[PDB]
Amino acid sequence: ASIEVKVQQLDPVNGNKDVGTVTITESNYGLVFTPDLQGLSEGLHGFHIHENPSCEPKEEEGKLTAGLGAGGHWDPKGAKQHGYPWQDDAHLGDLPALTVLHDGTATNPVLAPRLKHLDDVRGHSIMIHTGGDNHSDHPAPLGGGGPRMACGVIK
Amino acid sequence: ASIEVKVQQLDPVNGNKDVGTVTITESNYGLVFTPDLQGLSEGLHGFHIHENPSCEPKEEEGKLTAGLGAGGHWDPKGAKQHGYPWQDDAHLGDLPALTVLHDGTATNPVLAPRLKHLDDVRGHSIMIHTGGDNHSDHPAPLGGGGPRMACGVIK
Ligand SMILES: [Cu+2]
Ligand SMILES: [Cu+]
Ligand SMILES: [Cu+]
Ligand SMILES: [Zn+2]
Ligand SMILES: [Zn+2]
Known part of the structure; x- marks a missing residue:
């Protein structure tokens, strides 16, 4: 069993752009997220599941x-x-x-040990941030992820 | 946990050089390897525990x-x-x-879910390869890691 999530770079101005997919599978140690993305800025990027199954923008202070x-x-x-x-x-x-990677692609899989079943993550979204993730709220909030750069809805 | 492993870039001819450390700690989901390395080549690198507590070279066909x-x-x-x-x-x-990363540094921690206790890795070595890791013996053996770029002995 698996869930193929379509991911898009977020662009509230001229429209979101497809950047690939993230496939979620189950392993004996938790859910595995295998990316197949491209067109992204090189480096480490914050990667988290957000509460709402939406990647739409929202007015925040104008x-x-x-x-x-x-x-x-x-x-x-x-x-x-x-x-x-x-x-x-x-x-x-x-x-x-x-x-x-340097060529803007991402294909290295990662494991989320606390997530056990695919059905558990359905109805939520996967977010890729412009910044990285030091896995702390110190010194920056939410690991320093900052702005939301790419997103997909888990269905 | 906490075992600070000193890691060196390997060069049997020109001599080895310190490139930082990899700190191993225990989590409720397995051992966590937190690197603090510099001077390495950009990209993903094969990362494995090798059997012997040594980073010394050995003769291979002279x-x-x-x-x-x-x-x-x-x-x-x-x-x-x-x-x-x-x-x-x-x-x-x-x-x-x-x-x-592009700047030659590595600080992103990774989890090895199958390794449960610190003592299990003591008496062995941690290796960083020149190539990456596709986690298979195909199309290249041992994930395509190839040559050994850096290494540290786990005490
Ligand atoms: Cu680069
Ligand atoms: Cu996020
Ligand atoms: Cu290795
Ligand atoms: Zn969080
Ligand atoms: Zn292996």
Whole structure:
């Protein structure tokens, strides 16, 4: 079983652009997210499951903000803090950082040990940030992910 | 946990050079390897625990080859197959690939779900290859890691 998520670079002005997919599979140690993306800025990128199954933008203080429609990091256990994928008292949506190579592609799979079944993540969104993820709210909030650069809805 | 492993770039001729550390800690989901490395080549690199507690070279067909003193991938359960970090019938030493950014640094931690206790890795070595890791023995053996670029002995 698997879930192929279509991911798009968010552009509230001229329209979202397809950048590939992220395929979710189950392993004996948790859900595995295998990316097949391209056209992205090289480096480490914050990667988390957000609460709403939406990648639409939302007006925030006069600005149509990319991906705000997805809401915050998925936190069904009410951890109320950003952490490591292997930290029990961190948002359940906190996944390992995504690696984008020099050529703008991302194909390295990552494991989210706290997620066990595919049905558990359906009805939410996967977000890729412009910044990275140090898995802490220190010194920057939410791992320093910053703006939402790409997103897909898990169905 | 906390075992700070000193890592060196391997050069049997010109001499080895310090490139930083890899700190190993225990999490509720397995051992976490947190790198703090510099001076490495950009890209994903094969990252595995090798059997011998040595990073010394060894003669291969008359050629003193970097890191061969470390032996092969640590495979205490006799999987005799290279695979994913979350694959039970793969070498127990198979870790997630290490990400080295454009600037040559690596700070992104990775989880090895099948390694449960610090002591299990003591008495072995941690290897960073020149090539990447597709977590398979095809089309290249041992994930295509190829030559051994950097290494550290786990005390
Ligand atoms: Cu680059
Ligand atoms: Cu996020
Ligand atoms: Cu290796
Ligand atoms: Zn979070
Ligand atoms: Zn292996």
